[PDB]
Design a binder for this molecule. Structure first.
Ligand code: 0D3
Ligand code: CA
Ligand code: CA
Ligand code: ZN
Ligand code: ZN
Length: 158
C-alpha cells in the first residue's frame, strides 16, 4: 500500500493542451481533485510553479520516463504511485483529442482516474467504477465518485 503520509498535497500543471483553454484545463483538474477530497482527508493545493508533489503534464511518445505514450487512442495517460520524484505524477498523451464534452476524450474523467493512481489506487474489475481499466463516458455535470472508488480511497486513508 503506497500512500501519502501527508494530507495537504500540492500540484502543478506544467503545460497545457491547445485543444482546451487554460481555464478549462485548470477547471478539469481542480474538479477531479475535489472528487477525492470529498471522500478522503486529502486537501489539494495548486502552485503556479516550484516543485509540486504531483506534476501534471501533456507529453508525447517518448517523454523521459520509460513509459512512452502511443499516438491517438490506445493508452490515454498514466500516473505514478504515491512517492517522491516522479511519484504521484500524472502524464496525459498530448496526441489525444481532449474535450470537456461527451466527445472522446473528456479530460476531467481521465484526470479523475489518473489522480486515483497518484493517491495509491489500482484498477478495479467493477465496470461501474472510475478505476476500471477502460474509459467510458459518464455525465460529468454533477459527477460523483462510484461507491467502489469511495471504498478504495477509504481503505487507504480514512
Ligand atoms: C486502455 C485505455 N486506458 C487508459 O488510457 C487508462 C490508463 S491508467 C486511463 C483511463 C482509464 C479509464 C478512464 C479514464 C482514463 C483506454 O481506455 N483507452 C481508450 C479507449 N477506451 O478507447
Ligand atoms: Ca494514446
Ligand atoms: Ca511527484
Ligand atoms: Zn509519463
Ligand atoms: Zn488506470
Amino acid at each position: 500500500n503506497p500512500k501519502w503520509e501527508r494530507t495537504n498535497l500540492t500540484y502543478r500543471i506544467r503545460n497545457y493542451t491547445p485543444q482546451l483553454s487554460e481555464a478549462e484545463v485548470e477547471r478539469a483538474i481542480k474538479d477531479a481533485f475535489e472528487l477525492w477530497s470529498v471522500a478522503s482527508p486529502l486537501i489539494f493545493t495548486r502552485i503556479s510553479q516550484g516543485e509540486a508533489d504531483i506534476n501534471i503534464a501533456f507529453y508525447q511518445r517518448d517523454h523521459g520516463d520509460n513509459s512512452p505514450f502511443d499516438g491517438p487512442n490506445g493508452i490515454l495517460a498514466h500516473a505514478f504511485q504515491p512517492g517522491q520524484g516522479i511519484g504521484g505524477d500524472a502524464h496525459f498523451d498530448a496526441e489525444e483529442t481532449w474535450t470537456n464534452t461527451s466527445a472522446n476524450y473528456n479530460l476531467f474523467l481521465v484526470a479523475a482516474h489518473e489522480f486515483g493512481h497518484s493517491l495509491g489506487l489500482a484498477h478495479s474489475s467493477d465496470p461501474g467504477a472510475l478505476m476500471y481499466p477502460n474509459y467510458a463516458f459518464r455525465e460529468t455535470s454533477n459527477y460523483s465518485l462510484p461507491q467502489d472508488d469511495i471504498d478504495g480511497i477509504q481503505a487507504i486513508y480514512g
